[PDB]
Design a protein around this ligand. Structure first.
Ligand SMILES: CCCCCCCCCCCCCCCCCC(=O)OC[C@H](CO[C@@H]1O[C@H](CO[C@H]2O[C@H](CO)[C@H](O)[C@H](O)[C@H]2O)[C@H](O)[C@H](O)[C@H]1O)OC(=O)CCCCCCCCCCCCCCCCC
Ligand SMILES: CCCCCCCCCCCCCCCCCC(=O)OC[C@H](CO[C@@H]1O[C@H](CO[C@H]2O[C@H](CO)[C@H](O)[C@H](O)[C@H]2O)[C@H](O)[C@H](O)[C@H]1O)OC(=O)CCCCCCCCCCCCCCCCC
Ligand code: CLA
Ligand code: CLA
Ligand code: CLA
Ligand code: CLA
Ligand code: CLA
Ligand code: HEC
Ligand SMILES: CC1=C(/C=C/C(C)=C/C=C/C(C)=C/C=C/C=C(C)/C=C/C=C(C)/C=C/C2=C(C)CCCC2(C)C)C(C)(C)CCC1
Ligand SMILES: CC1=C(/C=C/C(C)=C/C=C/C(C)=C/C=C/C=C(C)/C=C/C=C(C)/C=C/C2=C(C)CCCC2(C)C)C(C)(C)CCC1
Ligand SMILES: CC1=C(/C=C/C(C)=C/C=C/C(C)=C/C=C/C=C(C)/C=C/C=C(C)/C=C/C2=C(C)CCCC2(C)C)C(C)(C)CCC1
Ligand SMILES: CCCCCCCS[C@@H]1O[C@H](CO)[C@@H](O)[C@H](O)[C@H]1O
Ligand SMILES: [Cl-]
Lengths: 34, 81, 137, 342, 451, 334
């Protein structure tokens, strides 16, 4: 019935994809010792 | 409505969660490894806890020239022994 | 820059003997200093008497000299005035006065060395910030 | 004529979940890059070589202390293009020299242009008046005057605000100590506009909610409204009597009321922008000459104006060496201004 | 689903607990379940504090607010406030924790299992908000319970070990209270004191005899008033002055709790008798006076005549006069001269601080106490960096007095907003216009115009 | 119709040009007293020894002030929190030297403004309105209590209350930053979101309604004549406004219920200002903003400065200079 790949789909993922990668990078930082 | 599939439809569908139970943790782990391999430091030029200063100096490696700024940073980086 | 064994090497006594602390000792010294001392000595100053600080140069000119491990460990057992003339255990925390300063009751000899080591090493890291007060914050 | 231009126009203006439009060609890349640069910089990039500061999550800063900091003072007002003569195409060096700051500021500026074109574009398609776009000129005036005109009057980008929470706080305090910005009547008008705007927002919202007509039976009054109903949902006549009797005056023209709510905060922000344009040149409202002449000659004359200048003097002397490291200020303890004991 | 949606009840989900107004049985469950939450926290938090508690550190260095309350009552502490036995703290926590399960059980039963209304089931437990006689009877039961509670503090003070007395000769100790103050001129004289500086209203209570005797009077008064409100019904003047509804009664209570929250905030900030500084740390006034004392002591030992040292302003560097002549500490602490504390009062003569006692009678335990309180001033950051706002990291400290005062000001403030919210709503609902203005009957259209 | 009932019907009459009411019976005299004293003190009061160190500060126009520098100066630090009515002074000259007028003005003002809040509740009852306009006013009112009463209480002196003047306000704000780091306090940050957000939504709501006004006038006349006071029908098309703003963001970020829109307009600044007031009131008890001074340390232990540490440098400048003659001992504990 509905498409899968729309403009909305692109807008959602340009934001959501880097967010998750950044969240994982920042989580790893919580274990860095000086 | 504008014709795209409702979000509540999508995020309660098994197929959405079959896909994203992989793609979401995969991106998270990619982000973790960007840091844990130390790659983030080298991409962005950010000091590690042991490379802000040389062992006995207490001056900042501050950029003071416009057009030789690139060489000034490279010089400060050499002086870290 | 790194916390190296050179940084962690400090005078053991007045005769020039040195001792090299471990990183674990230095970090234990810092924790025990915060526990028992920093309420008056945060940063190496003295809040209830700012004329006396914990800079090594100041400790060297105390009587007896306090710029080494043995002198500082003795101070924490039996503190004196700067000229050595008076014993101040009744108003300064020490093992001798652990009854009235209860936080000193669970410090052991090995703890005193670690605290002493922290006080001697921090100026080598912080320079003027140690004992300098707000001007160097 | 149904050429490619008109076909493109059709696709750009489709009624989708996220309207795009011609304005979206400018708006979306520039907004996205400005946001992505701020996130990238606050997560990974240092300020060690430009300011002597750690400024990223990577270095141990938190949400309040991360920033994308301004470039070094020695860069002047350089565009700092990635392919320019300072970074010379080196992405890592560019990050260390402060290239993310001009990247964010410039893509942000063009992103704001794009958002305001979007307000015009959508308004023209729907058929409403473009007052939302007109009201958005005030955020643009603020951004342009604080992030662009002000450093362009000063020695370099370094003295522009840095993009971070605590960095902006330092900007506030710098403006007190150096510019005496609280004394500036253009700032005063901006304060009036912002606080009067928050007041109007609160009081109009509360008045509507407490003069509602009973148009339903539920104790939740929100359901008793229909977007297409023709009647006012609250009583303007009872609202008017209440405020006339509580306050002396009241609104009676609902169209005037809502234009005034546009007018007050927008005018405020525009006034504050003008004052910052003056600070670009250090053209400050720093002093009252009449007070200084009296105080120089009469050591018993003291006001809250003279008291505040002493605070500014403390701010300048105590923060300048760390905040302006390229100047190399060495201020011995004995020259530092201090009161007794402290 | 009786009254469990917006259509049946009229209340949306975000006001869902308003659906309970006329369901006394479920309302009983909500109240009992909630009391269980209160008793749970008390018990659990105590055990947390105990597990984290090092007896050699002062309580105020350890983030403790409940153990200080138990220690003040005389359990677990000896001379000087030293901890002698942590078992009473363990007991108090365990018993509250176990009791919360009983209350939780009853609360969950009444809330979802028992009768939704109680009027069909029991006319003793049933009630109608509009029944002025039944409402004052329930009120009277709870006043009698409250009065017994106040007598339990008296029983602890007089018959079961006593109370910790920070003023006790010899440095502070647990003391049995044998002659509580009963003279109603003393007890009720506290209520007519000005609340301003040097007077302090009831916050100024400074001895345990007054504290205990005040609880005897409050115990009797509550019991009597409870009997009175069981036996009577509201008089005509009272009938005409109030709104008689569930929301109205809630709003009156909210006003009362707000008032009490604000009083508690000041009590813990100024009072060092029922909030002993041994357990809670020095008050703000106390630490500031303690700094002046510390430097008077230091400088006098160096040979200064502190009585005649003229400071930069012309006022004494160490000592000066209050606006009524008393000899007081100088510098900015001049604002704190109303401070009274056991470590300072030996220096006090008829005219205030006595220069002869200052020169000759300062004991090392006073120097110790003043240096301790000066370095534990109730200043500190939200992330618990102790000291002035410009201090560096090192000392992990925020005074319990700052935690207790800020939390209760915030709570008291929002409870005043809640009083206004519900009192205004109760008035409007009783009169019938809480849902909006009737279009066909808009009162302002029947009024003459203003001009 | 006895004389007491007649007075009660006049006091509570909904026909007086300005509503009096029972709250008004306290409000009118206390606000008159505070206003009259403020105006006289602002023009002609002699200098005041605010910090108790015999160093009087001039606040009035006749003693060398303009509108920007003038103030009613807070009462002396020697008084602290003691009550100081006129009759506790040996003379008016004493009372004026010690900052008597500040106490008279703020106590009458806080009473009057509290009764102004009840008066708002009261008239809404007489007119058959919903009662919560006064809840909105509690946010500015609580703020005034914070800086005139609560902060003096926690710090022990009305001499640290906010002065009644423009430059005096600035002085209060600067010293507040030095002693509590209010910028780093989340409640002040919520306050900023309250008023920045309040100003945004004000211009937002005003521009949207103005954008969707229904054409009722010619171009030569003000569009405001297209609305008539008391008219039954709405003057703008909220569906058109929703259709514009829904497409500006996305459809579900836009309100189409005017009642919940207007509730949101009320709640956002009011809740934000409540937090701002609670910031001042809790920093009154010295629970201060976040302290990250020297939080970042390198491998060797060198301090690595952050923007927080630059803020600290500025705070130290304010600390060491404020009240330059009023401290004899090294810690500014209140
Ligand atoms: C409204 C809505 C707008 C919507 C947003 C639009 C976004 C567009 C973004 C455009 C960005 C413009 C970048 C301008 C950079 C700049 O200016 O860069 C500055 C340069 C000049 O460079 C500066 O020049 C200075 C003076 O040097 C001169 O003097 C020196 C000392 O004696 C030496 O002799 C030296 O050799 C000599 O060049 C210093 O050297 C500085 O370090 C150096 O940065 O000018 C130049 O590029 C060009 C100067 C001429 C054009 C200026 C017009 C535009 C700016 C107007 C703002 C007014 C500001 C005045 C204060 C108010
Ligand atoms: C129904 C409503 C009717 C209204 C009635 C109006 C009549 C007047 C209202 C009261 C006004 C109070 C102003 C002064 C408050 C104050 O200085 O409070 C301080 C006093 C305590 O006084 C202090 O009490 C101290 C007592 O301690 C003494 O005794 C101790 C014994 O341990 C110690 O020894 C200590 O060292 C020693 O000094 C000292 O005397 C101090 O000098 C003295 O300042 O608190 C107290 O009396 C009790 C606390 C009072 C409440 C605090 C007011 C809070 C209001 C918040 C409203 C928010 C509204 C928001 C609107 C939206
Ligand atoms: C202290 C907090 C508290 C308490 C005691 C109550 C109590 C109640 N609420 Mg309210 N409510 C609350 C907060 C609370 N609420 C909050 C925060 C909201 C906003 C979301 C609401 C919104 C709301 C709405 C919209 C409604 C209620 C309703 C009710 C009543 C019936 C609930 C029901 O039937 O659930 C049935 C649910 C279950 C059977 C699932 C589990 C429920 C149990 C009790 C969980 C307890 C587990 C516990 C750990 C077990 C311990 C047992 C042990 C002691 C042996 C009940 C008296 C209803 C009502 O008014 O009825 C007329 C109703 O419609 N509430
Ligand atoms: C003992 C005190 C008490 C009691 C018994 C009630 C009871 C009631 N209130 Mg009242 N109220 C109170 C105090 C009280 N209130 C206070 C102190 C305030 C001021 C804030 C209010 C403001 C208020 C308003 C504005 C309204 C009510 C309403 C109501 C009715 C519906 C409540 C409901 O279901 O909420 C459901 C509960 C929720 C939706 C959850 C709220 C979540 C809060 C905000 C979170 C707070 C954060 C927490 C402290 C810490 C963060 C946690 C996080 C980190 C996880 C009910 C009769 C409604 C009414 O008028 O009905 C007649 C209504 O509109 N109350
Ligand atoms: C009377 C209330 C009160 C007070 C004064 C204290 C005080 C303290 N607690 Mg305790 N505690 C409490 C209740 C309280 N607590 C409750 C309800 C719980 C269960 C969650 C705990 C569980 C607890 C633990 C597990 C610990 C403490 C600890 C402490 C100490 C450190 C506090 C800290 O760093 O906070 C940090 C500051 C914050 C978290 C700020 C919270 C901001 C809130 C969310 C704002 C809410 C505003 C308002 C309520 C909402 C209004 C909304 C509006 C729309 C109406 C301090 C002595 C620590 C300690 O030292 O133990 C020895 C510790 O480890 N407490
Ligand atoms: C104030 C709280 C309170 C109130 C007013 C009620 C009221 C009621 N309960 Mg509920 N209930 C409660 C709490 C409460 N309960 C608690 C805590 C539990 C778990 C123990 C229960 C579990 C419960 C069950 C399983 C049942 C009820 C039932 C009832 C109804 C009949 C009770 C009766 O006639 O007993 C007569 C009176 C007594 C037996 C005297 C009891 C004396 C107690 C146990 C000793 C302690 C007294 C002292 C004051 C306690 C101080 C405690 C304090 C420190 C906290 C009545 C409406 C019944 C019902 O709903 O019928 C359909 C029913 O079956 N209750
Ligand atoms: C929770 C406790 C509580 C509650 C809610 C009530 C509630 C009630 N009482 Mg009861 N009462 C109580 C405890 C309580 N009482 C106790 C302990 C006793 C024994 C002393 C009494 C003895 C008593 C008598 C003799 C009477 C009542 C009456 C009433 C009713 C009228 C209330 C009224 O008009 O007050 C309004 C308060 C006043 C009118 C006081 C005067 C106004 C002053 C000026 C206000 C001052 C405020 C100021 C800020 C004070 C601050 C502190 C101050 C001490 C300095 C009301 C239902 C009346 C009734 O109808 O009986 C059937 C009545 O005649 N009560
Ligand atoms: C406040 C109650 C203090 C605590 C806690 C600690 N110290 Fe202290 N220290 C304090 C004072 C007032 C003085 C000067 C005493 C005098 O009159 O001479 C000191 C001095 C020292 C010194 C000597 C410094 C010098 O000679 O330059 C040392 C080495 C010292 N203090 C160490 C020390 C330690 C290790 C502490 C924790 C166990 C400690 N002090 C706590 C005040 C206070
Ligand atoms: C710069 C640059 C660029 C770009 C980049 C980009 C574009 C990026 C993006 C990025 C991104 C895009 C990122 C993101 C991130 C995100 C994040 C990091 C988030 C987080 C979040 C959180 C943390 C949350 C929180 C919260 C809140 C906020 C509230 C609610 C609740 C909670 C708590 C949840 C390029 C390449 C072109 C070129 C070069 C330069
Ligand atoms: C109704 C309702 C509700 C509510 C509920 C509630 C509120 C409940 C409560 C509940 C409760 C309140 C519960 C409690 C419980 C408890 C318990 C269960 C306990 C136990 C204990 C124990 C087991 C102990 C142990 C121990 C010991 C003894 C020793 C020491 C250690 C330890 C700890 C181990 C809600 C909201 C959800 C909604 C719906 C409705
Ligand atoms: C314990 C103690 C004590 C004592 C105490 C006491 C004895 C108390 C009492 C108290 C009291 C005895 C209180 C009272 C209160 C009251 C009130 C708070 C009231 C209020 C009122 C009202 C609120 C009213 C209102 C109204 C009006 C006015 C008009 C008409 C209508 C109405 C009703 C609304 C002492 C201090 C010694 C010490 C410590 C401990
Ligand atoms: C820059 C855009 C200018 C439009 S250009 C225009 O585009 C038409 C498509 O509709 C063509 O048919 C036509 O030949 C061309 O001149
Ligand atoms: Cl001082």
């Amino acid at each position: 019935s509905y498409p899968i790949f729309t403009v909305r789909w692109v807008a959602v993922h340009t934001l959501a994809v880097p967010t998750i990668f950044f969240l994982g990078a920042i989580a790893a930082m919580q274990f860095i010792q000086r | 409505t504008t014709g795209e599939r409702p979000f509540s439809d999508i995020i309660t569908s098994v197929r959405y969660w079959v896909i994203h139970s992989i793609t979401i943790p995969a991106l998270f782990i990619a982000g973790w490894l960007f840091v844990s391999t130390g790659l983030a430091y080298d991409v962005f030029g950010t000091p590690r806890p042991d490379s802000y200063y040389a062992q006995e100096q207490r001056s900042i490696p501050l950029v003071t020239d416009r057009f030789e700024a690139k060489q000034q940073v490279e010089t400060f980086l050499e002086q870290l022994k | 820059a790194e916390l190296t064994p050179e940084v962690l090497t400090v005078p053991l006594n007045s005769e020039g003997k040195t001792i090299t602390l471990t990183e674990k000792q230095y970090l234990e010294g810092k924790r025990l200093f915060q526990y028992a001392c920093a309420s008056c000595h945060v940063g190496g100053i003295t809040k209830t008497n700012p004329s006396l600080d914990l800079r090594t140069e100041t400790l060297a000119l105390a009587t007896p000299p306090r710029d080494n491990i043995e002198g500082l460990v003795d101070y924490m057992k039996n503190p004196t005035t700067y000229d050595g003339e008076q014993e101040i255990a009744e108003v300064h925390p020490s093992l001798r006065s652990a009854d009235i300063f209860p936080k000193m009751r669970n410090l052991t000899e090995k703890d005193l060395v670690a605290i002493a080591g922290h006080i001697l090493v921090e100026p080598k890291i912080l320079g003027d910030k140690w004992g300098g007060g707000k001007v160097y914050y | 004529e149904r050429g490619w231009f008109d076909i493109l126009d059709d696709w750009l203006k489709r009624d989708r979940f996220v309207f795009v439009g011609w304005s979206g060609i400018l708006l979306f890349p520039c907004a996205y890059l400005a946001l992505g640069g701020w996130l990238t910089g606050t997560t990974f990039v240092t300020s060690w070589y430009t300011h002597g500061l750690a400024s990223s999550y990577l270095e141990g800063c938190n949400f309040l202390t991360v920033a994308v900091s301004t470039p070094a003072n020695s860069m002047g007002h350089s565009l700092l293009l990635l392919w320019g003569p300072e970074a010379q195409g080196d992405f890592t060096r560019w990050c260390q020299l402060g290239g993310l700051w001009t990247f964010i500021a410039l893509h942000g500026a063009f992103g704001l242009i794009g958002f305001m074109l979007r307000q015009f574009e959508i308004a023209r398609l729907v058929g409403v008046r473009p007052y939302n776009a007109i009201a958005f000129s005030a955020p643009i005036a603020v951004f342009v005057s604080v992030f662009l005109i002000y450093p362009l009057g000063q020695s370099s980008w370094f003295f522009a605000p840095s993009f971070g929470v605590a960095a902006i706080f330092r900007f506030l305090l710098f403006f007190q100590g150096f510019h005496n910005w609280t004394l500036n009547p253009f700032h005063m008008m901006g304060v009036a506009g912002v606080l009067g705007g928050a007041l109007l927002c609160a009081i109009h919202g509360a008045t509507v909610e407490n003069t509602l007509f009973q148009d339903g039976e539920g104790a939740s009054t929100f359901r008793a409204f229909n977007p297409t109903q023709a009647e006012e949902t609250y009583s303007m006549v009872t609202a008017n009597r209440f405020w006339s009797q509580i306050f002396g005056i009241a609104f009676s023209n609902k169209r005037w009321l809502h234009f005034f709510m546009l007018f007050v905060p927008v005018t405020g922000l525009w006034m504050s922008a003008i004052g910052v344009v003056g600070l670009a040149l250090n053209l400050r409202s720093y002093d009252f000459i009449s007070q200084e002449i009296r105080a120089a000659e009469d050591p018993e004359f003291e006001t809250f104006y003279t008291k505040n200048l002493l605070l500014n003097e403390g701010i300048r002397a105590w923060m300048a060496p760390q905040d302006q490291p390229h100047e190399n200020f060495v201020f011995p303890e004995e020259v530092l201004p201090r009161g007794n004991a402290l | 689903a009786t009254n469990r949606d917006q259509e049946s009840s009229g209340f949306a989900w975000w006001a869902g607990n308003a659906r309970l107004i006329n369901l006394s049985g479920k309302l009983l469950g909500a109240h009992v379940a909630h009391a269980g939450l209160i008793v749970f926290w008390a018990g659990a938090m105590t055990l947390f504090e105990l597990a984290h508690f090092i007896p050699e550190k002062p309580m105020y260095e350890q983030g403790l607010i409940l153990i200080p309350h138990i220690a003040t009552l005389g359990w677990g502490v000896g001379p000087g406030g030293e901890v002698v036995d942590t078992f009473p703290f363990f007991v108090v926590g365990v018993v509250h924790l176990i009791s919360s399960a009983v209350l939780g059980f009853g609360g969950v039963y009444h809330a979802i299992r028992g009768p939704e209304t109680l009027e069909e089931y029991s006319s003793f437990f049933g009630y109608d908000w509009k029944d002025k006689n039944k409402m004052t009877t329930i009120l009277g039961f709870h006043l009698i319970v409250l009065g017994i509670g106040a007598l339990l503090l008296v029983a602890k003070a007089m018959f079961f070990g006593g109370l910790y007395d920070t003023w006790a000769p010899g440095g502070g100790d647990v003391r049995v209270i044998t002659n509580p103050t009963l003279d109603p001129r003393v007890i009720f004289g506290y209520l007519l004191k000005s609340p301003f500086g040097g007077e302090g209203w009831i916050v100024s209570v400074n001895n345990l005899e007054d504290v205990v005797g005040g609880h005897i009077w409050i115990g009797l008064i509550c019991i009597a008033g409870g009997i009175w409100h069981i036996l009577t019904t509201p008089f005509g003047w009272a009938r005409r002055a109030f709104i008689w509804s569930g929301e109205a009664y809630l709003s009156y209570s909210l006003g009362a709790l707000s008032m009490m929250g604000f009083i508690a905030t000041c009590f813990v900030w100024f009072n060092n008798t029922v909030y002993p500084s041994e357990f809670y740390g020095p008050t703000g006034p106390e630490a500031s006076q303690a700094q002046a004392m510390t430097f008077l002591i230091r400088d006098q030992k160096l040979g200064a005549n502190v009585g005649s040292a003229q400071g930069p302003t012309g006022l004494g560097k160490y000592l000066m006069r209050s606006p009524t002549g008393e000899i007081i500490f100088g510098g900015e602490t001049m604002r704190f001269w109303d401070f009274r504390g056991p470590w300072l009062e030996p220096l006090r003569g008829p005219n205030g601080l006595d220069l002869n006692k200052i020169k000759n009678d300062i004991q090392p335990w006073q120097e110790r106490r003043a240096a301790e309180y000066m370095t534990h001033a109730p200043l500190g950051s939200l992330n618990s960096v102790g000291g002035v706002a410009t201090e560096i990291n090192s000392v992990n400290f925020v005074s319990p007095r700052s935690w207790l005062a800020t939390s209760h000001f915030v709570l008291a403030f929002f409870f005043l907003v809640g009083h206004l919210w519900h009192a205004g709503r109760a008035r409007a609902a009783a009169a019938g216009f809480e849902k909006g203005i009737d279009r066909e009957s808009e009162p302002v259209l029947s009024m003459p115009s203003l001009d | 119709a006895n004389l007491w009932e007649r007075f009660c019907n006049w006091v509570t009459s909904t026909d007086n040009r300005l509503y009096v009411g029972w709250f008004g019976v306290i409000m009118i005299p206390t606000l008159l007293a505070a206003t009259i004293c403020f105006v006289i003190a602002f023009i002609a009061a002699p200098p005041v020894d605010i910090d108790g160190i015999r160093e009087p500060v001039s606040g009035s126009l006749l003693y060398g002030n303009n509108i920007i520098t003038g103030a009613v100066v807070p009462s002396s630090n020697a008084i602290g929190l003691h009550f100081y009515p006129i009759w506790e002074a040996a003379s008016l000259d004493e009372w004026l030297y010690n900052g008597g007028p500040y106490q008279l003005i703020i106590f009458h003002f806080l009473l009057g403004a509290s009764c102004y809040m009840g008066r708002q509740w009261e008239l809404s009852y007489r007119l058959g309105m919903r009662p919560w306009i006064c809840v909105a006013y509690s946010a500015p009112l609580a703020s005034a209590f914070a800086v005139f009463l609560i902060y003096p209480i926690g710090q022990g002196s009305f001499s640290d209350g906010m002065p009644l003047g423009i430059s005096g306000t600035f002085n209060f704000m600067i010293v507040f930053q030095a002693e509590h780091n209010i910028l780093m306090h989340p409640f002040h940050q919520l306050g900023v979101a309250g008023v920045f957000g309040g100003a945004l939504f004000c211009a937002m709501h005003g521009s949207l309604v103005t954008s969707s006004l229904i054409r009722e006038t010619t171009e030569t006349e003000s569009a405001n004549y297209g609305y008539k006071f008391g008219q039954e029908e709405e003057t703008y098309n909220i569906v058109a406004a929703h259709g514009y703003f829904g497409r500006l963001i996305f459809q579900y970020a836009s309100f189409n219920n005017s009642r919940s829109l207007h509730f949101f307009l009320a709640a956002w600044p009011v809740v934000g200002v409540w937090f701002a007031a609670l910031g001042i009131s809790t920093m009154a008890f010295n629970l201060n903003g976040f302290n990250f001074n020297h939080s970042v340390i390198d491998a060797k232990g060198n301090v690595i400065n952050t923007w927080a540490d630059i803020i600290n440098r500025a705070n130290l400048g304010m600390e060491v200079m404020h009240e330059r003659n009023a401290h004899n001992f090294p810690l500014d504990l209140a």
